[PDB]
Amino acid sequence: MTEYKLVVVGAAGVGKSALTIQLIQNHFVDEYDPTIEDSYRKQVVIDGETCLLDILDTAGQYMRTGEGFLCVFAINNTKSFEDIHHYREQIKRVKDSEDVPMVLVGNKSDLPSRTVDTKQAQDLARSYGIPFIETSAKTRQGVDDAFYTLVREIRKHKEK
Ligand SMILES: Nc1nc2c(ncn2[C@@H]2O[C@H](COP(=O)(O)OP(=O)(O)O)[C@@H](O)[C@H]2O)c(=O)[nH]1
Ligand SMILES: [Mg+2]
Numbered sequence: 001m002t003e004y005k006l007v008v009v010g011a012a013g014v015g016k017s018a019l020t021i022q023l024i025q026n027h028f029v030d031e032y033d034p035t036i037e038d039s040y041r042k043q044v045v046i047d048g049e050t051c052l053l054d055i056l057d058t059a060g061q062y063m064r065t066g067e068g069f070l071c072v073f074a075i076n077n078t079k080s081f082e083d084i085h086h087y088r089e090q091i092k093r094v095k096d097s098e099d100v101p102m103v104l105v106g107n108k109s110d111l112p113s114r115t116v117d118t119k120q121a122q123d124l125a126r127s128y129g130i131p132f133i134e135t136s137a138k139t140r141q142g143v144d145d146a147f148y149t150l151v152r153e154i155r156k157h158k159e160k
Contacts, residue, residue: 010072018137
């Protein structure tokens with residue numbers, strides 16, 4: 001199997017842990033300690049390649065060595081969306097590159113209180129040249145898609 005090192009970043013409270021816990025446990029957590037920053041492993045077949053996803057769920061070596069970044073905001077949190085820029089500047093600085101495998105994730109899609117429309121998120125991901133994927137860690141909508149798509153963005157950038 002092949003290792004892929006993934007890093008989930010974004011403002012406090014957006015769903016990094018919930019996304020990460022969904023992917024691995026297939027369940028939704030209401031209350032995950034917002035300070036717990038830790039690495040999780042998951043073995044999964046993605047397009048016939050057995051993959052070991054090594055995932056840092058940041059709380060706020062992986063930044064330097066992480067091969068791909070899920071930049072998460074919550075769609076019912078405008079501030080978190082506006083914050084994306086800073087998470088991106090951080091990763092560009094660390095990698096000394098504008099071409100970092102990256103997906104922009106708009107989480108909490110299940111929630112009715114939408115303050116960031118898909119067109120805004122699409123405008124942002126287009127400026128950056130990255131995919132935008134909408135998720136809900138609660139229903140699991142898009143969660144596999146965000147993580148797989150990040151894997152695929154990593155393969156697009158380098159041989160794995
Ligand atoms: N309804 C809903 N609540 C969510 C979702 N993701 C996270 N939450 C809630 O938002 C709070 C913060 O989640 P935790 O994100 O994982 O925050 P982070 O790890 O600091 O980004 C918790 O109460 C979660 O249950 C989601 O997709 N839908
Ligand atoms: Mg957390």
